[PDB]
Amino acid sequence: MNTRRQQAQNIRNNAAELAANRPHPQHINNKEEYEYRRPKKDGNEPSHIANFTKGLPHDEHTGLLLNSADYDQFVLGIQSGDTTDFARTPLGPAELPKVHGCLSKQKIDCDDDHRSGFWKSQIAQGAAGGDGAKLRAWESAGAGLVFDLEGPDAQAVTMPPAPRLESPELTSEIAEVYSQALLRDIHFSQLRDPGLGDQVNACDSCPTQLSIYEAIDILNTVQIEGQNWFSANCCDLTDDEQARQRPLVTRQNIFRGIAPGDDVGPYLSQFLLIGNNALGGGVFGQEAGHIGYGAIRIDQRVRKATPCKDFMTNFETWLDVQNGADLRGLETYVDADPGKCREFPAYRVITTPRDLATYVHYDALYEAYLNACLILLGMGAPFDPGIPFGGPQILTLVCEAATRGLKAVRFQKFNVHRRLRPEALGGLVDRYKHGKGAGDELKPVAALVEALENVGLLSKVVAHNQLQNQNLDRSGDPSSAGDNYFLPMAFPEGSPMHPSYGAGHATVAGACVTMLKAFFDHGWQLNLGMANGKYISYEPNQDGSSLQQVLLDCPLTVEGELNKIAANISIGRDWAGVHYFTDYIESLRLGEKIAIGILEEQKLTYGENFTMTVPLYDGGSIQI
Amino acid sequence: MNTRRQQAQNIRNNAAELAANRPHPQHINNKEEYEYRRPKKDGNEPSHIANFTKGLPHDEHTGLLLNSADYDQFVLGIQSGDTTDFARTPLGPAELPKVHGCLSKQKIDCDDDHRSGFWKSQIAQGAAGGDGAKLRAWESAGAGLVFDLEGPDAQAVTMPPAPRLESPELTSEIAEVYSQALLRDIHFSQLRDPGLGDQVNACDSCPTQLSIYEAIDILNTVQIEGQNWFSANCCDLTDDEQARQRPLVTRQNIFRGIAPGDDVGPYLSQFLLIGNNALGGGVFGQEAGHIGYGAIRIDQRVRKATPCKDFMTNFETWLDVQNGADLRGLETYVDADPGKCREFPAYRVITTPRDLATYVHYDALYEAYLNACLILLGMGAPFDPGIPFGGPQILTLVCEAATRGLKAVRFQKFNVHRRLRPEALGGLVDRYKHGKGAGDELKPVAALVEALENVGLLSKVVAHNQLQNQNLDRSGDPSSAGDNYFLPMAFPEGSPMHPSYGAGHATVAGACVTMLKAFFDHGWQLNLGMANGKYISYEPNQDGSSLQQVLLDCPLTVEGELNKIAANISIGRDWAGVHYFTDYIESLRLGEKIAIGILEEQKLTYGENFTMTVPLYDGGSIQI
Amino acid sequence: MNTRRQQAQNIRNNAAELAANRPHPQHINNKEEYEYRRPKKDGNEPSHIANFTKGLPHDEHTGLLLNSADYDQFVLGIQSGDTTDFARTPLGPAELPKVHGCLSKQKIDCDDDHRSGFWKSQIAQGAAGGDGAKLRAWESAGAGLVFDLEGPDAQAVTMPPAPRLESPELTSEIAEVYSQALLRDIHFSQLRDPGLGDQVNACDSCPTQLSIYEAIDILNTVQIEGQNWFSANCCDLTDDEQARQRPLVTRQNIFRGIAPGDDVGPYLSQFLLIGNNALGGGVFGQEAGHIGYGAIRIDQRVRKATPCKDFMTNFETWLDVQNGADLRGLETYVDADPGKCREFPAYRVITTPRDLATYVHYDALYEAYLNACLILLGMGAPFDPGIPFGGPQILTLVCEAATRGLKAVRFQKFNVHRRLRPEALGGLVDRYKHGKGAGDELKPVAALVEALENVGLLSKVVAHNQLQNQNLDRSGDPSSAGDNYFLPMAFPEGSPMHPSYGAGHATVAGACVTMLKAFFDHGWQLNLGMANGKYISYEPNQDGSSLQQVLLDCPLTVEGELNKIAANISIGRDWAGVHYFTDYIESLRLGEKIAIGILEEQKLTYGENFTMTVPLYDGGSIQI
Amino acid sequence: MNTRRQQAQNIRNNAAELAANRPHPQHIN
């Protein structure tokens, strides 16, 4: 009827119109940015305590935002597209200017080959070959202002307002992240019900301040104005809050996501542990952890970071990282055992949250979800019956969604919300407890720390930190002697150089597994064998030499493990100490909208009518 | 000036118009389809000897296309979008109908649990658990009729007419593929100049009919009407043929591509051998072959197929595969050595073309080019200076191009050219030599076989095949006693169920590495260390225990190794015996046009003006 | 200003744009389709137990879906528009194929004049004049893919996900439908509070297993995981579920709708009982049941089906109907009494739910709502004061909406949800209780049957069925001896040949009465006379000779009775045993959106501005 | 090829054009 040229152009115009006709939601945040004030001479200015200020100049003595004008230049640079204005923003340690209003541009470092003198912490000042740590800029400050050829636009979708410093929800979330830091070397067998099987401890025992039972107690009894987040009924919560509300914390659901299948079985998804049978006749099984990646394979053993070595446990170390000290690659890892094969224990199966924190430290965006795809393909997992059936589509399509997710979430990070990272909050706690801050600056975090103290959690982290500060890399720091309430960090550099709300990993996670659940038969039961009339499931044995079976009543499904791995990687960041729970759940849902939109638009490219049912994280299954 | 909604829609409309305004070339093939005739009663019909007829009914005795009506129904189903008409096409063994003109629909198998009786070869009739081999349909018969949201349309780009059975070019290409089959277990050290370093033989020595020197002789002296393809000057060749013409065959350039960097150094690209240094402090180096895939790793050891075991070496085996016998997964692989680590020798570094043929047998489209990306990222390879700089874009963007390439090439495979696979040609040679075919049916391949016989190559393959037919899986087949001129095949099933011209691997290869060369600094020199004032490069040692250094005067570049790996995977199919050289070179260029087009369209999504220079396979560097 | 031609075309273009600019919701179902699995050899497949499989081949012994491939072909035919693919689907009894994956196409009947041998039940095999029952195809498989000139498109509106087999809601709904089957011959006086007036029993007394009081008990105490549907608070229910949640079950609200006016007065709407006064001077009154249909009249007496004769009470009968046995018109009806006028008792006023089930068995879509219109017109009911005022518009406009409703709901039936009919669920209960189903196939309905057994309801239906199987038409069936937990059916053929969710009657009901409430003065009080200071209302006397007055404190309104008749016809299907409650309430709301949309579009056709207020079923009154 | 929304609107536009393109007779008494 019409030429190929016209059809191809029309289909691309119709996908553009489809995208534009979708509802465009209005971007709303929690008002905290300009609400919380601090006294200046003859008036008051915004504190920006609840904001992402990492990289901007912080005061060396008080550890707070040095000049509010820096934040204004930072924001103005983000809100406009102008990189020249954004470059005017000071970065790292800075001198306060003589006249108020002027930028504290006085950048202490610029073209400086030696810069040890500017950093306050031994780690930072001696790090970069003795020259002193370098600065690091804000990664992708204007990625949310980039368009795309497919999927919904970065601003055509959104996330709800984040929790507030006053809120019960936020108090439980920071308590959860604090707890995870103290449970960071717990063996993953512990993160389930003992009824499923025998549990063990990590081979490397360390001075633990907190146990799994205590964390369940603290998370259940922590409260603001006599209200616990998990215990509060629906009437007191807004519609946004009702959706992401969680039940009473238990062994089975602690530190887990709330999508279908997360509560079932072990904490770690099978796809982070198992592999495929060897190509052709088997030399090994799925227990070995070799993914059938073509005719070669992928080792499912993550590199082992030295157990029980946290970072940013004192004021000096924390401050330098907050002033953009580049401390990447200063983590220490365990050496290999000459006698053992497979570089053990330098590489071991993900055994503790530290190992998962290490995984998500260097993972390549879609890695976990591509690897899952390969495992399912190697197992002979069936595709959606509604789709007329190869792997080539799904293998590429799981990658495609990742970048579209990042653009959407970058807008939410920098342009919309600009939520502070858990480190920054951990700082406010410490800084508040040492009577710092001008006048009424830190009054908003009073309610927070009182609740965290009333459950005895701050006593634990101070006890944790004093042991952590006995290490020689930070023992010489002035603040190591006194009490420290900072959040123990898995990485020396801490969080990436971008805002907390809208998680990059969870947005990518949400977008990727949604594609996997769409293509594959989500109901398909992964049969990893049977044992004594019960279905076989794996989790790491102690020390990470191999896997250890757990026997379940019902077998694990495709959607369940795909939902669980999404949580593992997203929540893995929380274990590392760089995200709150809201960053996972709401970003999960954001990436879902991106993935669905791309599938809806690619629907037009086929000359036939088919349909692929894709399960939602909220219990339904939308049809595309 | 205007809302975000409108801009996003406009940019997608402008990318659609940009795509439509690009020149749309007309699709032209080599006329062979309806040219070559065979006698029927009271007239003549098309033979379709030069066409892809795999799956359609072949005659059990003569081994040729049984009924030309089947091919007409096959074509009509492809050329229209109608799957109902395409399903009418018979598939596998069939009975010839009583009235001429009618389809040989008489499908021998349909709902048959036992189907051993229909297959002529012991392998096929006893394969599927003793029930007999199953049929396999034509993979993606209408994938070339699917549109896309980005890049040029599947029909908005094309490839030139393929070589003809009469041509000098085709005679050299089949001679090249025959030679590769006989050199399939040669050690990769042999495929370069001895001046570069010491060469070795494979640990598993086998009765070789052909040597490397003889192959160079045969390929240089093979000729049709006194003209060698490599020796012919430009005046006798058409503009299409001049572009893909190669020089005199030598040790350094034999079985290699003609892009920049292919001639330099070892045959295998570094990216198929080396890995990264271990994350953090090194437990191993790049020589180990562990790619830094996040915090885990990728083993660069391919699974070892039993050396010197080829397939389809007699008439019975060949015929059944040509009648769509599903013989996938019937290859045998070597067991592991209990004493050795790393499942050696069940998995070894790609040591012989057999190992590369195994790699490309099961590789996941973009695997080799994603793995290369990861290696470059781990090495700290710099990006294009013109681009304002993460990995997230390039990591996703290398995958994105793959599916767009497949749609373009599927149209070229099924809709445009429909070239016969090298197996089918190998059949025509055998079938011609046994005086089969009605009247003047096989006269077109006379010139071919005379030239292949005059260089003494057919004497070699008959000598190869008689040794291959001594194996017990095929010794009981009737044709094993007599002479066989069939092409030895690496896989039991042989080629995929789709036409030869337009290679899937090479199109994907061409599209992927073009993206990698675009993003990365193509000029960057990979420094894998120095030794005695010369630059270190690796190739597999004998038996594949580890790598073996080769010292070069100049160091290897990013573009060179990216171009070499593109050839390795594409030409790897030729080693397996499923593609000619033209399938590589022209598909390489097709994928390049796809990749460039996608980059040109994604150029609009950025609110700023930048540029990324991307090197071409033909010597220039286009700017996008 | 412009010609009549242009205006007419513009108004039709503006109504098209208005329709397109309305919000287009995304279609989401309850995920059950591919979730519930059953074991096949070397893996697992979808059971499709929760899906509509009526017509597809069911296994003769186990009574479950024979081949999952049949369902895939069924779905693929629906999801595409291709009738050729849909015709490939097998229908009725079938042979299972020798090779797995292949369709169980092996259709047992095709061109068969005698087909008694294929059916398992005496009714079916001897039905069609002794030749044996015929097949029946799926009615309107692609009606949801048809557009319209007015109102919203079939896919431009939707319904929420249906209840699940695990859910408390579904357990109460099936318990409600089971109860209705056992109360099917109860006198309609019983379905209200005794305070309103004297109640009576049906003249034809039958062995009742259940009473009205027991049904109220069972429906109130039935529960899953200790939660009753009616007793559950809002926090445990999703927003969809909160809307359609009902209060504690009582005499007044049992088996009734939840729109305004449903709870008031007798169960049956006045419009199904009363007529008009005779034209001119009265020979009769409104009590006679003669509607003033022009100068003739409509008899309000439905044909009396033999009391207490249910169908599909054993396995044989149920199975044949599930295999598409055409058993329409095999119901028996009562003969007339020669002495009595008006063909009594062969025709009587709707006295029992059986009579309402008979009404909705053969009613002509809009009949009940057209008849209501005529009654209101004859009574001199006033139109909406906002409308500038004949009957011609409303008389036609009530019909207009019906077809638009059917197209919308057909899409929801076949394309979106594909929910199983109550018969199919009743089957799963029986089939589960006899230990049928492979492995873990019927585990999802375990929770269901345990709850239904714990309230003693299954004891009742087995007691009901054994008495029902004493009839000679089914006593010779093998399964009549043993226990049967099947749902007693009012019709021999059972439900229509289309999915359960999205009711045809309720969608049409919702669309029609919405038009009637829009045009008429919804507040107008129907004054059927007064008696002793109280307002007269009618309900059937015992035996159905005439009507019986009930005296109410307040008089009945137009909207109330129009809402009650909507429930009567919709819920009348539930009494017949072919729909759940969700099918009524959500379809009611679907038809409302259709009716409102048509009125909004026809609003443009008038050159003047007026408005008509139309009451909603959810308490408000939208203005158009 | 195109979304359900567009088709539904097009079909209603084509029925409007069909109606307008029919011959319009002149009214004579």
Automatic annotation (TrEMBL), chains A, B, C:
Disulfide-bond pairs as recorded: C102-C110, C206-C308, C234-C235
Residue stretches of biased makeup (Polar residues): 1-13
CDD domains: PAP2_haloperoxidase
Keywords: Oxidoreductase, Peroxidase
Gene Ontology molecular function terms on file: peroxidase activity
InterPro entries: Br/Cl_peroxidase_C, PAP2/HPO_sf, V-haloperoxidase
Protein name (database record): Vanadium-dependent bromoperoxidase, putative
Species name: Acaryochloris marina (strain MBIC 11017)
